[PDB]
Symmetry: C4
Subunit: 100 residues, 4 copies
């Protein structure tokens, strides 16, 4: 099943299975992701930072690799990983990787 995630007009596509492998995240939990469903467009809409999302989707595609894009600052990216609820395990890895 193909899913369309619209981040501020930038459309990402993936399979439901890709998101569902991390069920304790916003996009992996139907109950949380469905709060963001747009019934008019059959998409999930986020009125959020666009350049961070490459990395949020790749976290799922890669089975857990969390990497901040260089064109996106630390604090911006930190707020997005928290919003998408990637988990304390992933936040720990990220924190070691950047210093703090």
């Amino acid at each position: 099943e193909r899913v369309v995630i619209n981040v501020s007009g930038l459309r990402f596509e993936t399979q439901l299975k890709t998101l569902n492998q991390f069920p304790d995240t916003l996009l992996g939990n139907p109950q949380k992701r469905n709060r963001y469903y747009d019934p008019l467009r059959n998409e999930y809409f986020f009125d959020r930072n666009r350049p961070s999302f490459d990395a949020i989707l790749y976290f799922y595609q890669s089975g857990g690799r969390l990497r901040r894009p260089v064109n996106v600052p630390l604090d911006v990216f930190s707020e997005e990983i928290k919003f998408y609820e990637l988990g304390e395990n992933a936040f720990e890895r990220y924190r070691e990787d950047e210093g703090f």
Copy 2:
């Protein structure tokens, strides 16, 4: 209400409420933004630099965080923040952040 902002073919989407929170800017003022409405496509069209716009929309989404993308030079970005009329408060913060 969903808004489509077409910057040189790159389409951004946001909510009207997101833009309207900064009413003393081009995109937050209906009177100014409507000069750029494209009645054929039901979008606002800007024939302008594309890579700067991520940051112009995120200024609204973040409630005021103004950040220059690294792939975009200082002078290019400076001209865009002036064009979008982000305000002297925001221009001051930006100026401290980059030197000048």
Copy 3:
């Protein structure tokens, strides 16, 4: 008149007047740009490098500012400015700006 330039699937939009201000370039010369018209899609198609094009269109929008994106290497960008026939005046400025 709105123009759609499809660079390898990345669609850029501008006005004809924007391109026509530099008539001695590929995109500013109807005779040269029309070799790339796609009658099925009513677009100009280039099966070329995508990240360089932001900067090729901005050269026209800015009235002549030629800048290489940082995510695009020198030799890649040099080949694109030559292909788009931006002119020896612009190529000189670029050459000073990068060394050689």
Copy 4:
């Protein structure tokens, strides 16, 4: 013949001839690329990293120039060139270019 390659929602377009010049790669071999055909959308779908793909398509357009985008880390890019089966000749050049 125009081909649409959908990488996680980012659509790339090229000509079949462009891909077919490197027949010993995934995208240059009909038998391998067709495993990824999406009959509902008449596209080839890859649920993969988006920022690396500029460079994978440009490898074909340029007749062999393989370059890692700067916004994409070494290990991420290395996994994509292996997946797309660009060849040991190209992997050797890449390895010299980055160290290892």
